[PDB]
Design a protein around this ligand. Structure first.
Ligand SMILES: [Mg+2]
Length: 467
């Protein structure tokens, strides 16, 4: 008895690690994509160490004042989301959620004393994202769907362009985005049900690994944001090695690129070119066409035999050339080891991926969360993980500031102000940039009345937050 929970954030900036959520929209559906129960819509009050990015507030229309006025404390905000997410059998899905919104969720759970991952895998739960399914559909079975292009003819998967081009539309608040996501998913399910079921059924770690055929040197299709839109985000790849550090990474080679440099260079030169940003490569030297597949992120892979002859022709795929390159790679006994060889703080808010929680810590965290604000002030717990002490403090200071001692309040105030004002103290943006970016935006000739009010609100928020 499983369900799909579709969601989206509007946030105060584009850095999931540092910029906090402002709005959440959620809609649960059955596996037919028909809604169950009511949509959820929540605002999150910004804690008093938050400085939003001006441009984001203009795009969303959401000021810190609006969020404070209509929202919940972050603890309750995330607890209500966590409730919906952790209902057994729930697959939590969205549109580009895995590489953005889910990171916002992980960091938010983390700060608020939840395990960042349990909602993703316990009690039959899982994740999904439709963006790579759409990339595969457009690349491999585009029939029956209008694939929009922008003004200069470049391909676009933007939610609004896609929905209008296919006549399933009906502004950018989170709720409209979520409903448009569900509708786009329905459209794929209707026009290409077999692909839809293939991608969905194969979305998990185990199943994605199996599709890679590691290590039979079998070429497969892989779609990714990292491959060029001019090639429909698709490449013919082969899995060559497990990633040295990331246990969920498999490194794959784009068989359209001459592998001579990968074969000929030593481990030192290979590491060098592989860590040189493409912009900084010398002239005549292209990049090493290796790419990491993150098995835990619902990567989309299909067998080479999914190509019909019109698809190969349409995608301008040279199978012989790929085969020729594959032959050369099969001959190198040492290549996997060489690849693995070539590929090899402080702030608790920035240390989510520094290590996993123990079973013990998880238990004390749960107990602390069950307490009332008063009980929580008296707790005096003991942690195995070194990150949790300071982390517990900020959680109390942000959501329950009336619960602090006089000297605790002075500690919060020192941290709070220097996060708001000094570079590298947690925030993506500090007060002076915030004001400078407000100035830049104020100088433009094409501000709406609404834009001005928002920029006015932002000035007032900065004035108020430092007093
Ligand atoms: Mg979104």
């Amino acid at each position: 008895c499983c369900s799909l929970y579709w969601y989206d954030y509007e946030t105060f900036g584009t850095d999931p690690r540092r910029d906090r959520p402002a709005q959440f929209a959620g809609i649960r559906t059955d596996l037919e994509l028909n809604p169950i129960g009511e949509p959820v819509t929540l605002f999150c009050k910004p804690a008093r160490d938050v400085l939003p990015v001006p441009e984001a507030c203009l795009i969303t229309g959401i000021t810190p004042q609006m969020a404070a006025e209509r929202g919940l404390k972050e603890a309750e905000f995330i607890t209500r989301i966590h409730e919906q997410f952790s209902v057994p059998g729930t697959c939590v899905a969205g549109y580009n959620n895995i590489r953005f919104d889910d990171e916002v969720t992980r960091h938010c759970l983390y700060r608020n004393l939840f395990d960042p991952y349990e909602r993703e895998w316990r009690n039959g739960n899982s994740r999904w994202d439709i963006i790579d399914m759409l990339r595969l559909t457009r690349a491999l079975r585009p029939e029956g769907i209008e694939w929009p292009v922008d003004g200069s003819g470049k391909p676009s998967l933007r939610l609004e362009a896609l929905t209008v081009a296919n006549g399933i539309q009906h502004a950018h608040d989170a709720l409209a985005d979520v409903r448009a996501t569900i509708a786009v998913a329905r459209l794929v399910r209707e026009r290409q049900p077999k692909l839809f079921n293939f991608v969905f059924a194969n979305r998990g770690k185990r199943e994605a690994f199996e599709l890679l055929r590691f290590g039979a040197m079998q070429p497969v299709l892989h779609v990714s944001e990292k491959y060029a839109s001019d090639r429909y985000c698709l490449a013919v790849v082969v899995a060559l090695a497990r990633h040295p550090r990331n246990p969920n990474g498999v490194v794959v080679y784009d068989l359209s690129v001459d592998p001579t440099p990968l074969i000929d260079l030593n481990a030192e030169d290979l590491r060098e070119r592989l860590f040189t940003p493409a912009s900084k490569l010398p002239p005549g030297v292209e990049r090493i066409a290796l790419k990491t597949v993150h098995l835990n992120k619902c990567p989309v892979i299909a067998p080479l035999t999914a190509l019909r002859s019109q698809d190969t022709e349409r995608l301008q795929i040279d199978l012989d050339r790929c085969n020729r390159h594959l032959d050369r790679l099969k001959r190198e006994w040492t290549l996997p080891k060489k690849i693995r060889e070539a590929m090899t703080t402080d702030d608790p808010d920035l240390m989510l991926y520094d290590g996993f929680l123990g079973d013990a810590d998880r238990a004390v965290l749960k107990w602390l969360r069950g307490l009332t604000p008063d009980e929580l002030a008296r707790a005096q717990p003991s942690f195995e993980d070194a990150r949790l002490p300071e982390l517990l403090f900020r959680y109390r200071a942000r959501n329950f500031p009336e619960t602090l001692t006089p000297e605790e309040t002075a500690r919060w105030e020192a941290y709070r102000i220097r996060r708001l004002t000094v570079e590298g103290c947690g925030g993506s943006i500090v007060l002076n940039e915030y004001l400078a970016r407000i100035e830049a935006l104020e100088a433009s000739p094409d501000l709406s009345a609404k834009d001005r009010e928002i920029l006015k609100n932002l000035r007032e928020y900065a004035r108020e937050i430092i007093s």
